[PDB]
């Protein structure tokens with residue numbers, strides 16, 4: 304069958320600049336009828352792939368003029384000009400010349416932006432969760448850059464590592480930043496036996512960590 | 522193209538997904554690539570790798586295409602989309618989770634404190650996925666929705682929303698959580714603490 308290859312998992316680009324995504328097939332995608340059966344799709348998290356280019360170089364309707372496609376019989380390129388934040392995502396090329404149809408591995412577009420410190424917010428457990436016996440303390444470290452960041456929980460001064468689950472969002476399509484969520488889970492029993500809860504964000508943008516805390520009594 | 526949001530199937534069990542054009546089926550593992558399975562024309566075309574595993578049919582009566590997956594395994598857990606080729610129209614897709622665990626609706630807890638950040642905690646649900654929104658979609662700009670994380674057979678997910686501080690609680694904000702597998706959606710209006 305026909306193998307579609309994309310020799311790049313991701314590509315870096317400064318907003319406003321142009322960039323190219325590449326793709327190659329193991330056989331010529333040029334049909335005798337003069338057409339070249341090659342699609343370019345874009346997929347954003349939690350969404351189905353959206354059509355960008357059909358028949359190798361045809362801009363699909365609804366897609367900004369900033370996108371363009373070109374290629375030979377086996378090499379294809381998708382140019383994103385004057386790149387914007389909303390352009391983050393994974394781009395896939397697909398051949399539909401022959402069954403079985405095959406897709407390339409996809410290349411994720413990553414924006415290189417200015418550093419940004421995280422905006423930290425801490426939330427005590429909700430009364431609804433407490434009535435069920437659990438106590439989750441949640442911290443949001445939003446809109447920071449670069450992606451790498453560290454969080455630290457403390458209870459009455461002691462670092463707590465267990466019952467902690469973190470999750471990072473994908474690159475934000477609005478401001479090109481990243482965010483992370485940290486949740487500390489306890490039982491009400493234990494949650495009611497400690498007073499101060501603290502989360503600490505340690506990011507490159509600063510030496511001393513951003514800290515937020517609250518007192519169950521206050 | 523209407524497709525169920527999710528299907529929890531016991532391992533070894535089978536399942537039939539529902540959906541002048543060609544209806545194609547595509548598979549995709551969370552965070553992975555795309556594979557073409559085959560298609561039908563309401564003549565069928567199968568991808569050799571999926572022969573048998575998949576069975577493609579169509580009911581002209583109710584006009585719905587079907588793909589039956591047989592004796593599922595973990596390798597089979599993935600989003601399955603049906604896409605109509607006339608600009609191909611991709612479906613919302615069905616996330617099939619092969620597991621012996623039982624479906625468990627989520628607990629949705631509100632999280633309240635020049636801008637202000639409200640949040641929403643979605644705990645203990647299974648299987649994925651959940652569709653979270655704010656004010657039924659009205660708010661998207663200041664939104665951050667963190668990928669669910671699996672911990673002890675249960676998924677947990679959070680989402681934050683930031684708005685001009687003077688507009689909350691005066692201009693109400695509500696968390697909406699859809700859980701296709703359990704067919705339940707929950708709305709939690711965030712109240713001041």
Ligand SMILES: O=C(O)CCCC(=O)N[C@H](Cc1ccccc1)P(=O)(O)OCC(=O)NCCc1ccccc1
Pocket residue numbers: 334340399400401402404543544545546547557560604606609
């Ligand atoms: O055997 C052959 O000659 C070609 C078999 C494949 C085929 O017919 N593809 C068609 C294109 C074509 C037209 C004229 C000549 C050659 C190819 P086709 O792409 O219209 O096939 C119909 C079809 O079901 N296409 C699905 C495309 C698609 C599937 C899944 C996700 C995104 C896109």
